[PDB]
Amino acid sequence: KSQIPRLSAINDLHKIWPTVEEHGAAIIESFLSLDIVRRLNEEVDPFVKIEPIPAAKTKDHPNHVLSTTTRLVNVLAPISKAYREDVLNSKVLHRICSDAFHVYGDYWVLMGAVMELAPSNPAQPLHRDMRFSHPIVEYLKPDAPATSINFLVALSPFTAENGATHVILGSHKWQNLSNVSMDATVRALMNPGDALLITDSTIHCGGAETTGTETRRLLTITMGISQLTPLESNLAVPRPVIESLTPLAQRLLGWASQRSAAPRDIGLLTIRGNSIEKTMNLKAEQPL
Amino acid sequence: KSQIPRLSAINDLHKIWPTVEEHGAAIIESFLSLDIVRRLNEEVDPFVKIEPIPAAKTKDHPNHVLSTTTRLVNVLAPISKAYREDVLNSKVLHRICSDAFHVYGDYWVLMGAVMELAPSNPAQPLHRDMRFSHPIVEYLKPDAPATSINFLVALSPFTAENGATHVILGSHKWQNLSNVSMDATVRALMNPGDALLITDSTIHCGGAETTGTETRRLLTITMGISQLTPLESNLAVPRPVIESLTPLAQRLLGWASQRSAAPRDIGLLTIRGNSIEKTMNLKAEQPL
Ligand SMILES: O=C(O)CCC(=O)C(=O)O
Ligand SMILES: O=C(O)CCC(=O)C(=O)O
Ligand code: NI
Ligand code: NI
């Protein structure tokens, strides 16, 4: 069977979204440089270590879906300089997203999270994303353009043996889900910095960690239209941090009003005809 | 032709949503008491007077749709004690919304706005709401449960001559829109405090002000699922005001995390497994 299409972030930028639109998946080679992967890893390292189990009883909003061998940490902006500056302003990310979401309008981050899988982490069931947070998406028409996409960035090597992600190519167009089998999958073998890009309709799953020794880590960036509510909030991020960001990064984190693609768009998160950033005189690019 | 069903907020509460589900519209008599209408009016009065034209060039997010004879003021929580306390905690509103949105999960205010129409304000074109802000809704399946509803509360008398709202009964179920005519409409004749409730699929329009003397005013409350982004932001509302509200009112204004109806819901606007209100130790019901 055919493998996931591989593309250059450098030479094939315009080809990335068309490829996903057709096959439901693509691997973007060197989506993040090794320098950014390295800095990102240093910055999130301690936060993944302290993270309790997904359904820890201390939690207000426990995650009962992820395995006990999974650690997920989100709201990455206050944690990671590399995240807030390099990845939130990614030229490649923003081209793909504008290609993807132009029919709808503005987009933002629904969730940016580092996921680390412990040795012997079992495979996830084959699934589509967004079903534990946005029931609305199941009521969209089959042909509606994707309202969210997910960049699964490798922060350590993805191998067949250490649980590299599985995808079913073309599955984003499936309606009848009775050929859903692991038999129909191909793997996303990736070096750190490579990214598997999928849509919210692409059938996929994290793979089984078989070695009992390797730890797999990824940065999952779910980008979605500004008409959908993010899974995470940046409301509690200190203002000096927010004010250190670019206007674009501020918008991505819900610290700006948003716009739809309606010809006479009246806007989202406005305040009596004016933006959030104007009203609160939110500054931008003020270093710490 | 058949008139818009009229219901008591007191005796027919359980019948309100079933009625709208069937006919696409219903009039809730005495939705707000005259006391609340009176206080609401006193509190918003000066803010409607100072409001410029919808597309005023000073505005960051101008509204190019509404007439120049329309004044709309939103983000009502800091303006109106009656709004933030009485209407945001409305027993009748919350029963209807939970009846309406239980399939999806939590709901919140997409926009609470006072609209005042000047004498001789022309009729609006027949329309469905949400099309200038949420293109996503047009891509929902025809039978998807409504993801937003609109309470059109009279703050002054609605008469045939002063431009009472028109609705086409049953139009929320229409797909083919070629019988859209003013010939197919009925009026929402209302006393102050009565509310016309419609869905985001109900075909309707503000009526023509014919007297050249009367000013018509309304409180439009668009309640919608927490998975959809509000048209307005409460991000800039002073914290003593937010902390004066009930937990429920805080949620409605985006000052709390939200939950979907997914059996293993992972939540919306969360912060590493915990709520906004916990993280920011947001207090509640602290009077001013
Ligand atoms: O672990 C992976 O490679 C995929 C993770 C995933 O699909 C998810 O957690 O939703
Ligand atoms: O003025 C009215 O009665 C209806 C207003 C309306 O439908 C709107 O502004 O969307
Ligand atoms: Ni997934
Ligand atoms: Ni309308």
- The answer to whether B265 faces chain A, any CB pair under 8 Å, is yes
Report the nearest atom of ligand 2 relative to the CA of B204.
7
**Which residue is associated with the tokens 């409460």?**
B234
Instruction: Count Cα atoms within 13 angstroms, Cβ side, for B272.
Output: 18
| Rounded distance between C-alpha atoms, residue B114 and residue B74, angstroms | 7
Separation of first and last alpha carbons in chain B: 51
Residue A273 touches chain B, beta carbons under 8 Å: yes
Resolution in A: 1.7
> Residues of A numbered 82-121 whose beta carbons fall under 8 angstroms of chain B's beta carbons: which are they?
103-105
Q: Is B61 annotated as a binding residue?
A: no
Best residue among A201, A204, A216, A222 to mutate for probing ligand 1, ranked by most atoms within 8 Å of CB: A204
Most distant CA pair in chain A, distance: 58
For residue A108, what is the enclosing H or E element? strand A107-117
Please, which contacts does A279-284 make with residues 24 or more away whose CB atoms are closer than 8 Å? A279/B236, A280/B235, A280/B236, A282/A242, A282/A243, A282/A250, A282/A255, A282/A256, A283/A243, A284/A243, A284/A245, A284/A246, A284/A247, A284/A250
Q: Which residue has the tokens 């219901």?
A: B7
Residue A201 burial (C-beta neighbours within 10 Å; 0-12, 13-18, 19+):
buried
In contact, A220 and A53? CB cutoff 8 Å: no
Which residue is closest to A235 within chain B, CA to CA?
B276
- Subunit contact B257:A65, Cβ cutoff 8 A: no
Give the number of other Cβ atoms within 10 Å of residue B172's Cβ.
Answer: 22
In the PDB record, what is the listed experimental method?
Answer: X-ray
Instruction: Answer yes or no: is A134 a known binding residue.
Output: no
> Which element (helix H / strand E) includes B113?
strand B107-117
Query: How many separate domains does chain A show?
Result: 1
Measure the CA–CA gap between B24 and A106, rounded to whole angstroms. 31
Q: Which residues pair with A254 in a beta bridge?
A: none
CB atoms within 10 A of CB B175: 6
Do residues A272 and A229 lie in contact, with contact meaning Cβ atoms separated by under 8 Å?
A: no
Reported as half-sphere exposure (CB side, CA atoms, 13 A), residue B275 has a value of 16
Inter-axis angle of helices A91-101 and A13-23, nearest 10: 50
Q: What is the CATH number of the domain that holds B243?
A: 2.60.120.620
Report chain A residues whose CB lies below 8 A from the CB of B260.
132-135
CA angle B109/B174/A264 to nearest 5° reads 50
Token pair, residue A208, equals 């089984």
| CB of A156 shorter than 6 A to ligand 1 | no
The 3-state DSSP class for residue B134 equals coil
Asked if B267 contacts B260 with a C-beta cutoff of 8 angstroms, the reply is yes
For residue B286, give its domain range.
1-288
Strand partners, B198: B25, B150
* Residues in chain B, overall count: 288
Contact A133 B271 (CB under 8 A): no
Contact A273 B56 (CB under 8 A): yes
The CA–CA distances, whole Å, from A167 to A179, A196, B49, B85 equal 13, 10, 58, 50
Vertex B205: Cα angle to B199 and B209 (nearest 5): 145
Looking at this protein, which amino acid is placed at residue A115? M
**Residues sharing a CB contact under 8 Å with residue B250, sequence separation 6 or more, in sequence order:** B242, B256, B277, B282, B284
**A268, B133: Cβ pair inside 8 Å?**
yes
The rounded Å distance from CA A205 to ligand 1 centre is: 6
Nearest to B205 by CA among B119, B120, B125, B121: B125
Compute the count of residue pairs across chains A and B with CB atoms less than 8 Å apart: 197
Could you give the CA distance from residue B235 to residue B253 in angstroms, rounded to a whole number? Answer: 9
What residues contact residue B22 under an 8 Å CB cut-off, 6+ apart?
none
CB–CB of B260 and A133 under 8 A? Answer: yes
**Which stretch of DSSP H or E encloses residue A44?**
helix A34-50
Question: DSSP readout, B149-186?
Answer: EEEEEESS-B-TTTT--EE-TTGGG--S-SS--GGG-E
Tally of CB atoms within 10 A around A149: 24
Question: Nearest C-alpha to atom 7 of ligand 2 is from which residue?
Answer: B205
Q: Tell me if A228 sits within 8 A of A269, measured CB to CB.
A: no
Question: What tokens does A4 get?
Answer: 């996931």
Residues of chain A in contact with residue B54, where contact means CB-CB under 8 angstroms, are 273
Which of A160, A150, A169, A168 has the alpha carbon at shortest distance from A207? A160
Closest by CA position to A195, among listed A161, A223, A218: A218
Q: Report d(CA B18, CA B14) in Å as an integer.
A: 8
